[PDB]
Design a protein around this ligand. Structure first.
Ligand SMILES: C/C(=C\CC/C(C)=C/COP(=O)(O)OP(=O)(O)O)CCC=C(CF)CF
Length: 269
Protein backbone atom coordinates (compact mmCIF):
# COMPACT_ATOMS: atom_id res chain seq x y z
CA UNK A 1 0.00 0.00 0.00
CA UNK A 2 2.98 2.30 -0.64
CA UNK A 3 3.66 4.29 -3.84
CA UNK A 4 6.40 3.13 -6.15
CA UNK A 5 8.86 6.00 -6.54
CA UNK A 6 12.08 6.47 -8.50
CA UNK A 7 14.50 9.39 -8.55
CA UNK A 8 14.19 11.60 -11.66
CA UNK A 9 18.01 11.49 -11.92
CA UNK A 10 18.10 7.68 -12.21
CA UNK A 11 19.40 7.50 -15.80
CA UNK A 12 22.51 9.59 -15.12
CA UNK A 13 23.14 7.65 -11.90
CA UNK A 14 22.90 4.32 -13.71
CA UNK A 15 25.13 5.46 -16.57
CA UNK A 16 27.91 6.67 -14.24
CA UNK A 17 27.67 3.90 -11.63
CA UNK A 18 30.89 2.14 -12.71
CA UNK A 19 33.26 5.11 -12.31
CA UNK A 20 33.39 4.97 -8.51
CA UNK A 21 34.08 1.22 -7.99
CA UNK A 22 36.71 1.21 -10.76
CA UNK A 23 38.61 4.15 -9.25
CA UNK A 24 38.78 2.33 -5.89
CA UNK A 25 39.86 -1.03 -7.30
CA UNK A 26 36.57 -2.76 -6.51
CA UNK A 27 36.07 -3.65 -10.20
CA UNK A 28 39.25 -4.38 -12.16
CA UNK A 29 38.08 -6.37 -15.21
CA UNK A 30 35.54 -5.68 -17.92
CA UNK A 31 33.75 -8.93 -17.10
CA UNK A 32 33.44 -7.82 -13.48
CA UNK A 33 32.03 -4.52 -14.76
CA UNK A 34 29.38 -6.31 -16.83
CA UNK A 35 28.56 -8.59 -13.90
CA UNK A 36 28.07 -5.46 -11.79
CA UNK A 37 25.79 -3.75 -14.33
CA UNK A 38 23.62 -6.87 -14.54
CA UNK A 39 22.66 -6.57 -10.87
CA UNK A 40 20.74 -3.31 -11.28
CA UNK A 41 22.23 -1.59 -8.25
CA UNK A 42 21.87 2.03 -9.38
CA UNK A 43 18.27 1.22 -10.25
CA UNK A 44 17.82 -0.14 -6.73
CA UNK A 45 19.39 2.95 -5.16
CA UNK A 46 17.17 5.24 -7.25
CA UNK A 47 14.15 3.49 -5.69
CA UNK A 48 15.47 3.47 -2.12
CA UNK A 49 16.29 7.19 -2.54
CA UNK A 50 13.76 8.75 -4.96
CA UNK A 51 14.28 12.08 -3.15
CA UNK A 52 17.99 12.21 -4.06
CA UNK A 53 19.62 13.58 -7.21
CA UNK A 54 23.18 14.35 -8.23
CA UNK A 55 25.95 13.53 -5.78
CA UNK A 56 23.44 12.58 -3.07
CA UNK A 57 22.03 9.84 -5.29
CA UNK A 58 25.55 8.91 -6.40
CA UNK A 59 26.31 8.21 -2.74
CA UNK A 60 23.35 5.83 -2.60
CA UNK A 61 24.45 4.11 -5.80
CA UNK A 62 27.93 3.58 -4.35
CA UNK A 63 26.45 2.11 -1.16
CA UNK A 64 24.44 -0.42 -3.16
CA UNK A 65 27.52 -1.11 -5.30
CA UNK A 66 29.66 -1.58 -2.19
CA UNK A 67 27.05 -3.78 -0.51
CA UNK A 68 27.08 -6.46 -3.20
CA UNK A 69 30.82 -6.23 -3.87
CA UNK A 70 31.34 -6.72 -0.11
CA UNK A 71 28.89 -9.60 0.32
CA UNK A 72 30.66 -11.27 -2.62
CA UNK A 73 33.86 -11.59 -0.55
CA UNK A 74 32.08 -14.14 1.68
CA UNK A 75 30.85 -16.68 -0.88
CA UNK A 76 35.06 -20.24 2.08
CA UNK A 77 35.86 -17.11 4.11
CA UNK A 78 32.17 -17.00 5.00
CA UNK A 79 32.52 -20.45 6.58
CA UNK A 80 35.08 -19.55 9.28
CA UNK A 81 34.13 -16.71 11.67
CA UNK A 82 37.81 -15.99 12.37
CA UNK A 83 38.52 -15.19 8.71
CA UNK A 84 35.26 -13.25 8.34
CA UNK A 85 36.18 -11.10 11.34
CA UNK A 86 39.68 -10.46 9.99
CA UNK A 87 38.11 -8.70 7.00
CA UNK A 88 35.19 -6.99 8.76
CA UNK A 89 37.55 -5.53 11.39
CA UNK A 90 39.57 -3.86 8.63
CA UNK A 91 36.44 -2.39 7.06
CA UNK A 92 34.89 -1.43 10.41
CA UNK A 93 38.15 0.32 11.35
CA UNK A 94 37.13 3.11 8.96
CA UNK A 95 34.47 4.14 11.50
CA UNK A 96 37.21 4.91 14.06
CA UNK A 97 39.66 6.86 11.89
CA UNK A 98 41.80 6.84 8.74
CA UNK A 99 42.68 3.48 7.27
CA UNK A 100 46.25 2.37 6.58
CA UNK A 101 47.11 2.43 2.88
CA UNK A 102 47.55 -1.36 3.15
CA UNK A 103 43.84 -1.88 3.88
CA UNK A 104 42.06 -3.96 1.21
CA UNK A 105 40.19 -2.07 -1.55
CA UNK A 106 36.79 -3.02 -0.13
CA UNK A 107 37.81 -1.14 3.04
CA UNK A 108 38.93 2.05 1.31
CA UNK A 109 35.62 1.91 -0.55
CA UNK A 110 33.55 1.75 2.63
CA UNK A 111 35.68 4.56 4.09
CA UNK A 112 34.92 6.74 1.07
CA UNK A 113 31.20 6.07 1.50
CA UNK A 114 31.38 6.71 5.24
CA UNK A 115 33.41 9.90 4.79
CA UNK A 116 30.65 11.25 2.53
CA UNK A 117 27.79 9.93 4.68
CA UNK A 118 28.89 11.87 7.82
CA UNK A 119 29.88 15.27 6.38
CA UNK A 120 27.17 17.78 7.30
CA UNK A 121 25.32 15.56 9.78
CA UNK A 122 25.27 16.13 13.53
CA UNK A 123 27.95 14.25 15.51
CA UNK A 124 25.26 12.29 17.36
CA UNK A 125 23.78 11.19 14.03
CA UNK A 126 27.22 9.97 12.92
CA UNK A 127 27.82 8.08 16.16
CA UNK A 128 24.43 6.39 15.84
CA UNK A 129 24.97 5.45 12.20
CA UNK A 130 28.46 4.18 13.04
CA UNK A 131 27.02 1.72 15.56
CA UNK A 132 24.48 0.54 12.98
CA UNK A 133 27.45 -0.30 10.75
CA UNK A 134 29.20 -2.18 13.57
CA UNK A 135 25.98 -4.13 14.11
CA UNK A 136 26.09 -5.03 10.41
CA UNK A 137 29.69 -6.25 10.49
CA UNK A 138 29.18 -8.06 13.80
CA UNK A 139 26.28 -9.85 12.14
CA UNK A 140 28.53 -11.14 9.37
CA UNK A 141 30.79 -12.64 12.05
CA UNK A 142 27.76 -14.13 13.81
CA UNK A 143 26.42 -15.88 10.70
CA UNK A 144 29.86 -17.26 9.84
CA UNK A 145 29.95 -18.78 13.33
CA UNK A 146 26.63 -20.47 12.48
CA UNK A 147 28.44 -22.16 9.57
CA UNK A 148 31.23 -23.67 11.71
CA UNK A 149 12.93 -17.81 14.73
CA UNK A 150 16.51 -17.47 15.99
CA UNK A 151 17.46 -16.76 12.36
CA UNK A 152 16.00 -13.25 12.66
CA UNK A 153 18.36 -12.30 15.51
CA UNK A 154 21.24 -12.54 13.01
CA UNK A 155 19.49 -11.74 9.72
CA UNK A 156 18.04 -8.47 11.01
CA UNK A 157 21.59 -7.07 11.15
CA UNK A 158 23.15 -8.67 8.05
CA UNK A 159 20.32 -7.65 5.70
CA UNK A 160 21.74 -4.13 5.95
CA UNK A 161 18.41 -2.30 5.99
CA UNK A 162 19.27 0.18 8.76
CA UNK A 163 22.39 1.62 7.04
CA UNK A 164 20.26 1.88 3.91
CA UNK A 165 17.62 3.83 5.84
CA UNK A 166 20.36 5.88 7.50
CA UNK A 167 21.67 6.92 4.09
CA UNK A 168 18.21 8.09 2.99
CA UNK A 169 18.46 10.75 5.72
CA UNK A 170 21.90 11.82 4.50
CA UNK A 171 20.71 11.74 0.88
CA UNK A 172 17.74 13.92 1.86
CA UNK A 173 19.91 16.16 4.08
CA UNK A 174 17.58 15.78 7.06
CA UNK A 175 17.66 13.98 10.40
CA UNK A 176 14.62 12.43 12.08
CA UNK A 177 14.43 13.82 15.65
CA UNK A 178 16.83 11.59 17.56
CA UNK A 179 14.43 11.04 20.45
CA UNK A 180 11.77 9.89 17.99
CA UNK A 181 14.21 7.49 16.33
CA UNK A 182 14.71 5.90 19.75
CA UNK A 183 10.95 5.66 20.33
CA UNK A 184 9.15 2.35 20.71
CA UNK A 185 6.86 3.23 17.80
CA UNK A 186 9.65 4.14 15.40
CA UNK A 187 11.64 1.07 16.46
CA UNK A 188 8.62 -1.10 15.65
CA UNK A 189 8.28 0.55 12.24
CA UNK A 190 11.98 0.01 11.54
CA UNK A 191 11.71 -3.60 12.72
CA UNK A 192 8.92 -4.17 10.19
CA UNK A 193 11.04 -2.64 7.43
CA UNK A 194 13.86 -5.04 8.32
CA UNK A 195 11.60 -8.09 8.59
CA UNK A 196 9.82 -7.34 5.30
CA UNK A 197 13.13 -6.92 3.46
CA UNK A 198 14.67 -10.22 4.57
CA UNK A 199 11.39 -12.07 3.96
CA UNK A 200 11.14 -10.82 0.37
CA UNK A 201 14.83 -11.60 -0.08
CA UNK A 202 14.54 -15.17 1.20
CA UNK A 203 11.64 -15.66 -1.22
CA UNK A 204 13.67 -14.31 -4.15
CA UNK A 205 16.67 -16.41 -3.04
CA UNK A 206 14.77 -19.72 -3.04
CA UNK A 207 16.00 -20.52 -6.56
CA UNK A 208 19.67 -20.02 -5.68
CA UNK A 209 16.98 -19.19 4.57
CA UNK A 210 13.63 -18.64 6.31
CA UNK A 211 11.84 -21.24 4.17
CA UNK A 212 14.03 -23.79 5.96
CA UNK A 213 4.89 -20.25 2.72
CA UNK A 214 3.38 -18.37 5.67
CA UNK A 215 5.92 -15.67 4.81
CA UNK A 216 3.56 -13.97 2.35
CA UNK A 217 0.90 -13.70 5.07
CA UNK A 218 3.61 -12.54 7.49
CA UNK A 219 4.53 -9.70 5.14
CA UNK A 220 0.86 -8.73 4.84
CA UNK A 221 0.36 -8.75 8.62
CA UNK A 222 3.47 -6.63 9.19
CA UNK A 223 2.46 -4.12 6.52
CA UNK A 224 -0.99 -3.83 8.09
CA UNK A 225 0.66 -3.23 11.46
CA UNK A 226 3.04 -0.75 9.83
CA UNK A 227 0.04 1.40 8.87
CA UNK A 228 -1.35 1.15 12.40
CA UNK A 229 2.01 2.41 13.67
CA UNK A 230 2.10 5.22 11.10
CA UNK A 231 -1.21 6.55 12.42
CA UNK A 232 0.32 6.84 15.91
CA UNK A 233 2.96 9.29 14.66
CA UNK A 234 0.92 12.50 15.25
CA UNK A 235 0.47 11.56 18.91
CA UNK A 236 4.11 10.41 19.06
CA UNK A 237 5.14 13.84 17.79
CA UNK A 238 3.26 15.52 20.63
CA UNK A 239 4.56 13.15 23.32
CA UNK A 240 8.10 14.15 22.29
CA UNK A 241 7.04 17.81 21.83
CA UNK A 242 8.23 18.20 18.25
CA UNK A 243 8.20 21.70 16.78
CA UNK A 244 7.42 22.39 13.12
CA UNK A 245 10.85 21.56 11.65
CA UNK A 246 11.07 18.36 13.70
CA UNK A 247 7.56 17.30 12.66
CA UNK A 248 8.54 17.86 9.02
CA UNK A 249 11.73 15.81 9.42
CA UNK A 250 9.78 12.94 10.99
CA UNK A 251 7.39 13.09 8.03
CA UNK A 252 10.36 13.11 5.65
CA UNK A 253 11.70 10.08 7.52
CA UNK A 254 8.39 8.22 7.21
CA UNK A 255 8.02 8.77 3.46
CA UNK A 256 11.57 9.07 2.11
CA UNK A 257 13.41 6.60 4.36
CA UNK A 258 11.16 3.94 5.89
CA UNK A 259 8.48 3.69 3.21
CA UNK A 260 11.08 3.80 0.45
CA UNK A 261 13.12 0.95 2.00
CA UNK A 262 9.97 -1.19 2.23
CA UNK A 263 8.68 -0.47 -1.27
CA UNK A 264 12.02 -0.10 -3.04
CA UNK A 265 13.20 -3.68 -2.58
CA UNK A 266 9.82 -5.02 -3.71
CA UNK A 267 9.79 -3.06 -6.99
CA UNK A 268 13.44 -4.01 -7.52
CA UNK A 269 12.84 -7.77 -7.19
C1 LIG B 1 18.21 -3.84 1.85
C2 LIG B 1 19.29 -4.00 0.79
C3 LIG B 1 19.04 -4.66 -0.37
C4 LIG B 1 17.70 -5.30 -0.69
C5 LIG B 1 17.61 -6.76 -0.22
C6 LIG B 1 18.78 -7.62 -0.68
C7 LIG B 1 19.22 -7.77 -2.13
C8 LIG B 1 19.46 -8.30 0.28
C9 LIG B 1 20.65 -9.21 -0.01
O1 LIG B 1 20.68 -10.39 0.79
P1 LIG B 1 21.97 -11.36 0.72
O2 LIG B 1 21.61 -12.69 1.34
O3 LIG B 1 23.11 -10.73 1.49
O4 LIG B 1 22.43 -11.61 -0.81
P2 LIG B 1 21.44 -12.22 -1.94
O5 LIG B 1 21.00 -11.12 -2.87
O6 LIG B 1 20.24 -12.85 -1.27
O7 LIG B 1 22.20 -13.27 -2.72
C10 LIG B 1 20.69 -3.44 0.93
C11 LIG B 1 21.68 -4.42 1.56
C12 LIG B 1 22.28 -5.34 0.52
C13 LIG B 1 23.06 -6.39 0.85
C14 LIG B 1 23.65 -7.28 -0.23
F1 LIG B 1 24.30 -8.37 0.28
C15 LIG B 1 23.32 -6.64 2.33
F2 LIG B 1 24.52 -7.24 2.59
Amino acid sequence: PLPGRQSPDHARAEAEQLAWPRSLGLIRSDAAAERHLRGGYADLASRFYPHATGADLDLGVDLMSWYFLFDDLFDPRGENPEDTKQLTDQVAAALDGPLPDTAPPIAHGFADIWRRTCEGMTPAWCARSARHWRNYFDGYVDEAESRFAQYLAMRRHTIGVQPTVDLAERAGRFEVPHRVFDSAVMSAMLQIAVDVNLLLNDIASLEKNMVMSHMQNEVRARLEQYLLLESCLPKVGEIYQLDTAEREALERYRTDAVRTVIRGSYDWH
